[PDB]
Paper text:
[name], a class C orphan [name], functions in cognition, stress-induced mood control, and synaptic development. Among class C GPCRs, [name] is unique as it lacks a Venus flytrap-fold ligand-binding domain and terminates Gαi/o protein signaling through the [name]-Gβ5 heterodimer. Here, we report the cryo-EM structures of [name] alone and in complex with one or two [name]-Gβ5 heterodimers. [name] dimerizes through Per-Arnt-Sim-fold extracellular and transmembrane (TM) domains connected by an epidermal growth factor-like linker.
Cryo-EM analyses for [name] (residues 1–863)–[name]–Gβ5 complex revealed three types of [name] states: apo [name] and the [name]:[name]:Gβ5 complex in a 2:1:1 ratio at an average resolution of 4.3 Å and in a 2:2:2 ratio at 4.7 Å. Since the 2GPR158–[name]–Gβ5 and 2GPR158–2RGS7–2Gβ5 complexes exhibit virtually identical structures, except for an additional [name]–Gβ5 heterodimer in the latter, we focus on describing the overall structure of the 2GPR158-2RGS7-2Gβ5 complex and close-up view of the 2GPR158–[name]–Gβ5 complex. In both complexes, structures of [name] and the four domains of [name] DEP (Dishevelled, Egl10, Pleckstrin), DHEX (DEP helical extension), GGL linker, and the RGS domain, and the Gβ5 subunit were clearly visible and their models fitted well into the cryo-EM maps. However, most of the cytoplasmic domain of [name] (residues 669 to 863) is disordered except for a coiled-coil (Ha and Hb) comprising 61 residues. Another [name]–Gβ5 heterodimer binds to the Hb helix, which is visible only in one [name] protomer. The second [name]–Gβ5 dimer is oriented in pseudo-twofold symmetry with respect to the first dimer against the Ha helical axes. Similar to the first dimer, binding of the second [name]–Gβ5 complex is achieved through helix Xα3′ from the DHEX′ domain. While DHEX′ of the second [name] binds to the Hb helix, the RGS′ domain of [name]′ shifts proximal to the micelles. Thus, although the interaction between the second [name] and Hb helix is not as extensive as the interaction of the first [name], the [name]′-micelle interaction contributes to the stability of the second [name]–Gβ5 in the [name]–[name] complex. The ICL2, ICL3, TM3, and first helix of the cytoplasmic coiled-coil provide a platform for the DHEX domain of one [name] and the second helix recruits another [name].
Numbering used by the authors:
A (entry chain C): 18 to 218, 256 to 450
B (entry chain A): 703 to 763
C (entry chain D): 15 to 353
Write the structure that this text describes.
């Protein structure tokens, strides 16, 4: 179960927190009104975080502390809503029987028990806040039968704990107050219990063959990948609109629209034209690049292979209703010998084509597309980038 | 003491004594809680006794 | 035979030593480090009435799609904050939405086992849900979709441990993948239009990548410490990293077949609930469970900011494709547009 590991890590945290030799010291304050022992101030825990965790931002360490304290690992002695506030207020750890890691789950009758007990310990005031008084009103109206032993065991517990010493009753009642704060919190702050429903739950011959495919699994050195990754970063590094953008026009930040609108304009910017020059794949991604490359191929009387590859791609878009209607037709137009558009195949290519053409398939012309595609990538794109039209358009 | 062994056994025995005291008071209330029906009182008493013996045998384990 | 198998493994170790002679960041320290960022809020959305649990950009680079857990899908304009659509799903826990390339339809579903798709346009002013046409349907809750660039074929993933491609009008299944045994949660297209492949990993602590031309589980990896909760391709089409509820994000190559560098920090402890790259392929994004976001350098491995905006947990996160900003999914019942 996932969150179990999370709670385990934070358990590591608090275990290092109340360390014998290091740790925060749980002090005993003396006041003009009273003498309160076994507390400490939130500035202490803030300092402890910053020391032993090296959390550079005070705010960041404070937010870590915030959610920790909203998972019941320490609470403010005079408040319902768990929030760590860096100041002189008094805190306390929680008990190993009342962590939240212990799969606990209170229920409505037990909330009634704690309500009767708190309301009946003191009888000097309605020692409570308006939300908890509201909850008790509902519990009354709906629990008409079962009240009595609730009251019974409540005052029984009151005697069984008051019989022990006066500071004991105080600390135990403080703890077993806060632990019900965290498991039924004030209307505002988020519950920290819930979870998402998603987590709501020959033999050696194939073995040996896996070993052999790992052998023939061609790999390259990490330095090679390093160069590839750095270089693919660099070639658009000057295009990153987060890090260093030359067009400062930011429709988000600087309330402009012109950047995208220039992007909509079919006329390519000089960035655009320099960016075409990296790879014809990116070109074909560009509609503008498709148009200009196709123009050159036409004016050079060489506008077929691109026509084919566009044909393959535009075929790979329609549903299964038209796959046969196109495959036979595209064969008869390009891959049927005797048609004007003469795609050119070798032995195994045309063999594969002839065998598959009976059956229209989502991966029909894979090897032929590879063949013509390596052809175009090897020949066309180079001369295009080398071409006068490319140079004249990249100049301005 | 703000502790783990001590406070662990402390809260544990606290809940334990609370349970056992609740049980004794239940034994007395058998006839004292004459306010409602017998079998209903019977069912409540039975459920309480069962859960209490369960919690006891678990505290013993 | 066992000895020979382990010796081939040792030979893989030897070739890995030769290939990784110097570490990724052991060479990466060479590139000049990076400077200060000042990103903070630039918008806010105030329409939902629950948590929000999915979001996607269009290709028009300005709209917004996001579905909720209470039956109500939305279509904003963060540039304008003015609703132009609305729609209600019959069910609860709508756990995945997707946007059409051109802007024609959106697929929302999960926990009802059937992934409906609605025609996005301003076609019928009566309802955005009334034209509900069942297209896919598994027998379990449905994790996500990737209209895989044709606008007539959508992926889906459920607790079945098996994904497939489902046509638009027909409901006619097109191929299947049954290499798994748990709940898969991840799915993303490749950036390349070379081989329309994709990845699926999941509760099994592993990740595996399908080749849609066959349906055969070619690559497969496992290093995570728990369930995984999303993944994304390195936007050059060459690798992909991720993070999960280990809080320990990692990045993986395709060509070397090896982990590249650890992404973790003891400070953050909570779960990792999304990732997505920046158009440079320089940064790294990830929404977390400790309510922050966390941009990390992809090379030098340091943090660069933590931009505290969300009163609750981060659900899922994306980069706009233009490359100009990013949004967050979060447990605070609203969205922001983080620039």
């Amino acid at each position: 179960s996932p969150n179990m590991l999370v709670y385990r890590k934070m358990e590591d945290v608090i275990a290092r927190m109340q360390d014998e030799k290091n740790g925060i010291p749980i002090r005993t304050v003396k006041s003009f009104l009273s003498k309160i022992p076994s507390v400490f101030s939130g500035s202490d825990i803030v300092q402890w975080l910053i020391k032993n965790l090296t959390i550079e931002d005070p705010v960041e360490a404070l937010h870590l502390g915030t959610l920790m304290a909203a998972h019941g690992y320490f609470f403010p002695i005079s408040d319902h809503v768990l929030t760590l506030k860096d100041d002189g207020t008094f805190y306390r750890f929680q008990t190993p029987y009342f962590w939240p890691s212990n799969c606990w789950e209170p229920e409505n009758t037990d909330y009634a028990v704690y309500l009767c007990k708190r309301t009946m310990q003191n009888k000097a005031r309605l020692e409570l806040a308006d939300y908890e008084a509201e909850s008790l009103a509902r519990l009354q109206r709906a629990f008409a039968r079962k009240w009595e032993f609730i009251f019974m065991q409540a005052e029984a517990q009151a005697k069984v704990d008051k019989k022990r010493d006066k500071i004991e009753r105080k600390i135990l009642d403080s703890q077993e107050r806060a632990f019900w704060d965290v498991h039924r919190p004030v209307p505002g702050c988020v519950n920290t219990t819930e979870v998402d429903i998603k987590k709501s739950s020959d033999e050696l011959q194939q073995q040996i063959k896996y070993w052999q495919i790992q052998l023939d699994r061609h790999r390259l050195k990490m330095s090679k990948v390093a160069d590839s990754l750095l270089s693919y970063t660099e070639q658009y590094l000057e295009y990153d609109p987060f890090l260093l953008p030359p067009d400062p026009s930011n429709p988000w930040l600087s309330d402009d629209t012109t950047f995208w609108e220039l992007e909509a304009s079919k006329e390519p910017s000089q960035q655009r034209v320099k960016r075409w020059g990296f790879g014809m794949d990116e070109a074909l991604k560009d509609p503008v690049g498709r148009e200009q490359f196709l123009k050159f191929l036409e004016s050079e009387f060489s506008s077929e292979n691109l026509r084919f590859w566009l044909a393959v791609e535009d075929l790979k878009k329609r549903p299964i209703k038209e796959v046969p209607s196109r495959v036979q037709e595209i064969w008869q137009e390009f891959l049927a010998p005797g048609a004007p558009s003469a795609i050119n195949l070798d032995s195994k290519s045309y063999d594969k084509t002839t065998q598959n053409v009976k059956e229209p398939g989502r991966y029909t012309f894979e090897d032929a597309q590879e063949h013509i595609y390596k052809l175009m990538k090897s020949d066309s794109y180079p001369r295009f980038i080398r071409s006068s039209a490319y140079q004249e358009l990249l100049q301005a | 003491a703000w502790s783990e062994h001590s406070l662990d056994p402390e809260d544990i025995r606290d809940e334990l004594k609370k349970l056992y005291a609740q049980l004794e008071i239940y034994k007395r209330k058998k006839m004292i809680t004459n306010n409602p029906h017998l079998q209903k009182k019977r069912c409540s008493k039975k459920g309480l006794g069962r859960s209490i013996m369960r919690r006891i045998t678990e505290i013993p384990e | 035979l066992k000895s020979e198998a382990e010796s081939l493994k040792g030979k893989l170790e030897e070739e890995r030593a030769k290939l990784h002679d110097v570490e990724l960041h052991q060479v990466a320290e060479r590139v000049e480090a990076l400077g200060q960022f000042v990103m903070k809020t630039r918008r806010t959305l105030k329409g939902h009435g629950n948590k929000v649990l999915c979001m996607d950009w269009c290709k028009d680079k300005r709209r917004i799609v996001s579905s909720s857990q209470d039956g109500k899908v939305i279509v904003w304009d963060s540039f304008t904050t003015n609703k132009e659509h609305a729609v209600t799903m019959p069910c609860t826990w709508v756990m995945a939405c997707a946007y059409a390339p051109s802007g024609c339809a959106i697929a929302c579903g999960g926990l009802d086992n059937k992934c409906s798709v609605y025609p996005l346009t301003f076609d019928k002013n009566e309802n955005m849900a009334a034209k509900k046409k069942s297209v896919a349907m598994h027998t379990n809750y449905l994790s996500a979709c990737s209209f895989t660039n044709s606008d007539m074929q959508i992926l889906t993933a459920s607790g079945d441990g098996t994904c497939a491609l489902w046509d638009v009008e027909s409901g006619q299944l097109l191929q299947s993948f049954h290499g798994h045994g748990a709940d898969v949660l991840c799915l993303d297209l490749a950036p390349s239009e070379t081989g329309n492949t994709f990845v699926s990993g999941g509760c099994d602590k592993k990740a595996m990548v399908w080749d849609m031309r066959s349906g055969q589980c070619v690559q497969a990896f496992e290093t995570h410490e728990s369930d995984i909760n999303s993944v994304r391709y390195y936007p050059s089409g060459d690798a992909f990293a991720s993070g999960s509820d280990d809080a320990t994000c990692r990045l993986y190559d395709l060509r070397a077949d090896r982990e590249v560098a650890i992404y973790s920090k003891e400070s953050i402890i909570f779960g990792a609930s999304s990732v997505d790259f920046s158009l440079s392929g320089r940064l790294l994004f990830a929404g977390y469970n400790d309510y922050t976001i966390n941009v990390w350098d992809v090379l030098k491995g340091s943090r660069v900011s933590i931009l505290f905006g969300h009163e609750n947990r981060v659900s899922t996160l994306r980069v706009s494709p233009d490359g100009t900003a990013f949004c967050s999914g979060s447990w605070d019942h609203t969205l922001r547009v983080w620039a």
